[PDB]
Structure formats: structure tokens, C-alpha cells
Design a protein around this ligand. Structure first.
Ligand SMILES: COc1ccc(Br)cc1S(=O)(=O)Nc1cc2c(cc1O)NC(=O)C(C)(C)O2
Length: 135
């Protein structure tokens, strides 16, 4: 038999939403800080690049990635959500960052370059979180 299962192919899943008209949203001091300070400082960091977009498992030849990671998250998505005022409070945005970092620690092994990157970005994240406005 001449069906060799070379098709259909893999794909990336649809990315997380960055808009949702029926989701409750607010602008708050803490969320403005999360954009202007937290996100924009991490974004410009030389370790940000693996985290600036939804994981392209096809390009990166990581065919197990979405088998293991069922709650993907990335800073491109977070940036767009903040630009679009998607969040109700700071907790929802912080949880997105925590998901991103946790995914990295699940998927990879301690000492991998990508884990060293996430650790540095997380350290910076936590330092900036400690100066969140308390008004
Ligand atoms: C061999 O690919 C590497 C090696 C080191 C680094 Br740093 C980055 C790459 S890659 O970007 O070409 N592939 C790659 C990217 C990864 C990961 C593993 C990779 O091989 N692990 C991850 O958690 C995500 C998806 C965020 O980033």
C-alpha cells in the first residue's frame, strides 16, 4: 500500500486571543506600569527573543512542544493584550508572565540555554514586580 502518511502535516495551534469584546477590561495604575516598565524592559533584553512570539514549533523543529505545553503564553501575546487593554487587573497579566516562565521550566532541562534566559528574565520580572504601584 502506497499511503505512506507523509500528509497531513503538523501545524502550530492558533495563538492565544489578544482581543475579546465580551471580556471585562479596565485600565489601572498597575497595568500601565506592567506595560511601560515591566513588559518594555523585558522586551528590549537580549534574552527576550525566544519569548517575543507564540512558539513556532514547526520552524523550531519542536514537534513535542504543544504535546507538552497546553497553556502556551508569550510576551508578544502579553504585549498585544496590554496594548489592547485586555486585562481586568494586574493579576491576570502577571499570571500570563508566570505561565510563560513555567512553560519554559516544564519543557526544557535545567542548565539549557533557554532556561538560563528564562531565569534571567524572571529575575528581572520579579525585581520590577516588587516596585509595582501600591496605590
Ligand atoms: C537548538 O535551538 C536553540 C538552542 C538554544 C536557544 Br537559546 C534557542 C534555540 S531555538 O530558538 O532555535 N529552538 C528552541 C527554542 C526554544 C526552546 C527550545 C529550542 O530548541 N524551548 C522553549 O521553551 C522555547 C520554545 C521558548 O524556546
Amino acid at each position: 500500500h502506497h499511503h505512506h502518511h507523509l500528509v497531513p502535516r503538523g501545524s502550530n495551534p492558533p495563538p492565544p486571543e489578544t482581543s475579546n469584546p465580551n471580556k471585562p477590561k479596565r485600565q489601572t495604575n498597575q497595568l500601565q506600569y506592567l506595560l511601560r516598565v515591566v513588559l518594555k524592559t523585558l522586551w528590549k533584553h537580549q534574552f527576550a527573543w525566544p519569548f517575543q512570539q507564540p512558539v513556532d514549533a514547526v520552524k523550531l523543529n519542536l514537534p513535542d512542544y504543544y504535546k507538552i505545553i497546553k497553556t502556551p503564553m508569550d510576551m508578544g501575546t502579553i504585549k498585544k493584550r496590554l496594548e489592547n487593554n485586555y486585562y481586568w487587573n494586574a493579576q491576570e497579566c502577571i499570571q500570563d508572565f508566570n505561565t510563560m516562565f513555567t512553560n519554559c521550566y516544564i519543557y526544557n532541562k535545567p542548565g539549557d540555554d533557554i532556561v538560563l534566559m528564562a531565569e534571567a528574565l524572571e529575575k528581572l520580572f520579579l525585581q520590577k514586580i516588587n516596585e509595582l504601584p501600591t496605590e
